[PDB]
Amino acid sequence: IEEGKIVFAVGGAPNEIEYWKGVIAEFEKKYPGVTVELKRQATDTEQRRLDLVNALRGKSSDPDVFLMDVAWLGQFIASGWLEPLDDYVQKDNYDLSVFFQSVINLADKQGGKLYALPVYIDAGLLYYRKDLLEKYGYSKPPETWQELVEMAQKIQSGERETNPNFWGFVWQGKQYEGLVCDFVEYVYSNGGSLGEFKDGKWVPTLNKPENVEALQFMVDLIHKYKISPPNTYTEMTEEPVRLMFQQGNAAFERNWPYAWGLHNADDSPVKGKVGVAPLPHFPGHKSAATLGGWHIGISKYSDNKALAWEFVKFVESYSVQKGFAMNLGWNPGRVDVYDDPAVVSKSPHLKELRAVFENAVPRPIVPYYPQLSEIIQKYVNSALAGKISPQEALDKAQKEAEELVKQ
Numbered sequence: 001i002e003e004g005k006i007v008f009a010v011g012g013a014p015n016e017i018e019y020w021k022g023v024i025a026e027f028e029k030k031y032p033g034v035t036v037e038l039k040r041q042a043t044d045t046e047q048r049r050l051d052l053v054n055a056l057r058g059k060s061s062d063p064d065v066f067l068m069d070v071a072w073l074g075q076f077i078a079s080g081w082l083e084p085l086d087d088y089v090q091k092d093n094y095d096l097s098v099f100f101q102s103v104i105n106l107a108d109k110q111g112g113k114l115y116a117l118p119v120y121i122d123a124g125l126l127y128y129r130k131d132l133l134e135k136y137g138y139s140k141p142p143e144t145w146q147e148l149v150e151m152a153q154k155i156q157s158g159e160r161e162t163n164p165n166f167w168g169f170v171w172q173g174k175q176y177e178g179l180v181c182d183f184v185e186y187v188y189s190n191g192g193s194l195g196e197f198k199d200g201k202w203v204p205t206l207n208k209p210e211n212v213e214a215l216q217f218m219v220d221l222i223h224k225y226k227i228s229p230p231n232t233y234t235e236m237t238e239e240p241v242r243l244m245f246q247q248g249n250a251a252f253e254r255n256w257p258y259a260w261g262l263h264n265a266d267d268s269p270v271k272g273k274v275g276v277a278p279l280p281h282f283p284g285h286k287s288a289a290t291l292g293g294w295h296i297g298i299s300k301y302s303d304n305k306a307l308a309w310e311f312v313k314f315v316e317s318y319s320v321q322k323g324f325a326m327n328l329g330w331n332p333g334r335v336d337v338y339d340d341p342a343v344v345s346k347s348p349h350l351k352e353l354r355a356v357f358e359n360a361v362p363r364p365i366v367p368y369y370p371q372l373s374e375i376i377q378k379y380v381n382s383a384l385a386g387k388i389s390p391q392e393a394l395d396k397a398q399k400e401a402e403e404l405v406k407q
């Protein structure tokens, strides 16, 4: 185990992990004298991050190649754990123009060097029960958050006559990274902002009036309009939300592109009855979608960097990317794939909602995001629980963010 072997560390939702196994099989079939060992990780992005930093900080060659959340990729680049890809691109005359340059420019490069490639580009999406909206006299998905609430309540009241577990709108509110993504969408769709850059350094503006107003709406979805379940802030993460909607217990769902792949699975009660649209916005502002996704990189400590690069090229290849979009519903890191007839047949929204993905709002791209996120999670979740007001929460978060930015 030191020649033509490579351990690929990857996680995700259960179905994605199973899909990766198939990808690895296809890779070894195309490259006969090579071995790729799967190092399975969890779904939770923080657990995936920890699994990786623990191996890397110990200069272990074990994980040779792996996926990194666009949210904390900057941390790995800054720490210097990634092997620059420039040399490998150069040697194979590899064409980089086939990837969305915006995400690359934003998160994959530093000091003129490339350290990773986008496997998929996630953006927040609104999933809705087309059949239920039609049933209750609504011809189109909601454009504003207030319209979503209106539809959600009428559908909820009607469905509860026979369904007491039905909720008009499910989303991620647990105290973890996913909550920051949901939060970002409400903030920017109300004209708010988490902060901006000054003199090359990010400066926090967590407690702007627009932000507080946005957080208040989130709190109201649970405690005032009551279209989102109480466990939204205690247990709801990607999968629990995705499962609840697929079970048929929700009219609306906010989730990432992967939910589509599952919702459209023949084992899905909602198959053929799900629509996808941009998330709503508050009047006078534009719809927002948080930028997410996973990028592939090579460990600086790998003893099989050449093989790792071969695997990277395969994962970023047209056919493999096409399979991700058609089977898993992922929005590819490689351009034009969304337009492939096979992809439009199974995941038409990748083409139709092109603007959603291209305009995804990035969380603060800074080496110390993990620590910043922890601050936002605590106060935002506390506010959702009703433990403190939106105002007190963002003001408190503002204080700690400033201290954190002070290095």
Ligand SMILES: OC[C@H]1O[C@H](O[C@H]2O[C@H](CO)[C@@H](O)[C@H](O)[C@H]2O)[C@H](O)[C@@H](O)[C@@H]1O
Pocket: 011, 012, 013, 016, 042, 043, 044, 045, 069, 070, 071, 122, 177, 178, 179, 181, 238, 256, 258, 291, 292, 293, 294
């Ligand atoms: O493909 C679904 C993936 O969802 C996670 O990733 C999204 O959600 C995170 C917050 O929970 C974001 O930070 C990330 O950028 C989004 O892509 C989940 O952590 C992954 O394991 C799933 O594969």
Ligand SMILES: [Cl-]
Pocket: 223, 386
């Ligand atoms: Cl209450």
Ligand SMILES: [Cl-]
Pocket: 222, 223, 230
């Ligand atoms: Cl409640």
Ligand SMILES: [Cl-]
Pocket: 326
């Ligand atoms: Cl197929």
Ligand SMILES: [Cl-]
Pocket: 322, 323, 326, 327, 342, 343
């Ligand atoms: Cl296909």
Ligand SMILES: [Cl-]
Pocket: 326, 342, 346
């Ligand atoms: Cl097909």
Ligand SMILES: [Pt+2]
Pocket: 222, 223, 224
């Ligand atoms: Pt309540």
Ligand SMILES: [Pt+2]
Pocket: 240, 243, 244, 245, 247, 249
């Ligand atoms: Pt459920």
Ligand SMILES: [Pt+2]
Pocket: 326, 327, 342, 346
């Ligand atoms: Pt297909």
